[PDB]
Ligand binder design. Structure first.
Ligand SMILES: O=C1Cc2c([nH]c3ccc([N+](=O)[O-])cc23)-c2ccccc2N1
Ligand SMILES: O=C1Cc2c([nH]c3ccc([N+](=O)[O-])cc23)-c2ccccc2N1
Lengths: 344, 341
């Protein structure tokens, strides 16, 4: 079988060129930006994904510069990056994860079942950790959706991926409002706001949580108008002031439709509570990623005896860094449970 | 079975209600605005669709107001309208029922690995452009042109534009929301968030429907606006800074993909030519609905001997009114062929 050898720059270490060899190359994605292949590293035999993008000589690649400064257990890792031609192409060698929340959720959905809540807790918590981390650098993902949430079935580790839309948001600087996928767009983006903040990622994460609980997207619609109608059916009509906070300079008025009426009976009240605090019209009213992690809905993950259904221990959930906690250090008293603090 | 009698107001003419009875009611759709039922008029036996929408009684329904004013062979007709309740009040629009949609017809061919015969692409697109020329002559923009809102009668090949729930009279200098129009059919200026767009957004949408019928699939798919723009750039090429200015409100620099390379071989050159004149970055550069009708791609419909594959004659295609031609009267010399009475 064919073996390709390239010389690449390490994704995060010091600039020490490495000779990398991979085989069994095969396509696994064709997203507008470029091609996403899967390959097998000759030596270790580990699987990797290679995102190949056309590199504009005009400017430096934004995804690459962002990926180079990230190092977190819940963010897909950039192992190496090198250029080729076959025309100038940037290749990003990333860790390959077997599943996605999108595929897992679809499997349960067409089997008429919902994902056990223990998994909803583990997945959402890890997503909020990854967001707390990138937001601490002022970086907004801008495309949070089930397809960009990679999962390892056995360990239950979740990893945020695809930073092709990510960007450092600077106060006072305008940003395009046409990023983010259909069902997951915050109201301010639908209204065309250009001064939105990182809280749009929080709205998107809230849509993912509601979707895992419901078994289907919570705010579907092929047009922004249809999406807003679904949002209004649940949150109610926006006050003129809330519309002002979403920013952008006439819908059939409806009242506060209980969130308890939204999900099936049995749904943990804490899950419903969390959704209501994430999916808020006013962007400043939504919980921050870190506050979300500290929410009572995730208390079970902080119990000393918690275990995965398959018997294994839960993945690392409390190894927080100073960087991660910077938005609100005091939260550590809740985020790091007593038993994770025993010195032994 | 069950018979329902209401006192309904005729869609057109003097506001004079009459008793109307209907039977065989059944849900046939669930839209965001409201349920859509089918029913049979007890007198005529004709089938009708009834759209029920919650009515904020302190204001006049815009869809109703626009519909009461429209009368065209290629626009679904508002037969009657009436109110009912469930302390909540509903406006019920009694519209003519049409058996098919371009969406369903196209899907049928698509999953059978075939494409709709071009004679139908011509008939359907021409009728859609006639309906657009008509509503635009009143300054009304549909704002949601897509396969699902194009009704079809299989036997006569008559097409009727429907669902005016997003339609609005566009007034120069007045701002309009940019979040109307469905995903694959949104003009670039809407994707960029323009608030001063014109009726030409309907033309871009119609161009997307034409390309889709020729291709067998949507031409500018994508779950985010960014993805949609990439697909648009792959075909039209990168927008000049000026074209971006005309659309109003950091992309790679790809060059124009020859339109002929876009469709399968065999595709009529005129079809390709029409698409390129509809799908233009600069909104003022796109053909007007009336100019589109007069395009050479539709010449076959103007041939005296044209017939539908099923042997029947084509539907009415030349009965233009002064209102319809107002944007450019001289086009009548092309629009109404010599043989046309
Ligand atoms: O590591 C990957 C690569 C990968 C998947 N989806 C993605 C979306 C975006 C990107 N990306 O690099 O941007 C990679 C991936 C994907 C899909 C199915 C199964 C496994 C899986 N895993
Ligand atoms: O006249 C209708 C009503 C109807 C269809 N689609 C629609 C989309 C919008 C509206 N509307 O009133 O807005 C009515 C309809 C539809 C669908 C399948 C088969 C026939 C058909 N016919």
């Amino acid at each position: 079988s064919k073996v390709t050898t390239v010389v690449a720059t390490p994704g995060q270490g010091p600039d020490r060129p490495q000779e990398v060899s991979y085989t069994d190359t095969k396509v696994i994605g064709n997203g507008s930006f470029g091609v996403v292949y899967q390959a097998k590293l000759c030596d270790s035999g580990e699987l990797v994904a290679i995102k190949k993008v056309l590199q504009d000589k005009r400017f430096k690649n934004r995804e690459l510069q962002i990926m180079r400064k990230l190092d977190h257990c819940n963010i897909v890792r950039l192992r190496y990056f090198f250029y080729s031609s076959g025309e100038v192409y940037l290749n990003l060698v990333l860790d390959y994860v077997p599943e996605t929340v999108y595929r897992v959720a679809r499997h349960y959905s067409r089997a008429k079942q919902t994902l056990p809540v223990i998994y909803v807790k583990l997945y959402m918590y890890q997503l909020f950790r990854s967001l707390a981390y990138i937001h601490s650098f002022g970086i907004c993902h801008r495309d949070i959706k089930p397809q960009n949430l990679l999962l390892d079935p056995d360990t239950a580790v979740l990893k945020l991926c695809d930073f092709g839309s990510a960007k450092q948001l600077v106060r006072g600087e305008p940003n395009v409002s046409y990023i983010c996928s259909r069902y997951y767009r915050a109201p301010e983006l639908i209204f065309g706001a250009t001064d939105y903040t990182s809280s749009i990622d929080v709205w998107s994460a809230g849509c993912v949580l509601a979707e895992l609980l419901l078994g289907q997207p919570i705010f579907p619609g092929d047009s922004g108008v249809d999406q807003l109608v679904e949002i209004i059916k649940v949150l109610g009509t926006p006050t003129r002031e809330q519309i002002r906070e979403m920013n952008p300079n006439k819908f059939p008025q409806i009242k506060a439709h209980p969130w308890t009426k939204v999900f099936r009976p049995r749904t943990p009240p804490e899950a419903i509570a969390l959704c209501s605090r994430l999916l808020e019209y006013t962007p400043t009213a939504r919980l921050t990623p870190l506050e979300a992690c500290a929410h009572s809905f995730f208390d079970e993950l902080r119990d000393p005896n918690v275990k995965l259904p398959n018997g294994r221990d839960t993945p690392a959930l409390f190894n927080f860094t100073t960087q991660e906690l910077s938005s609100n250090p005091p939260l550590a008293t809740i985020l790091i449970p007593p038993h994770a603090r025993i010195q032994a």
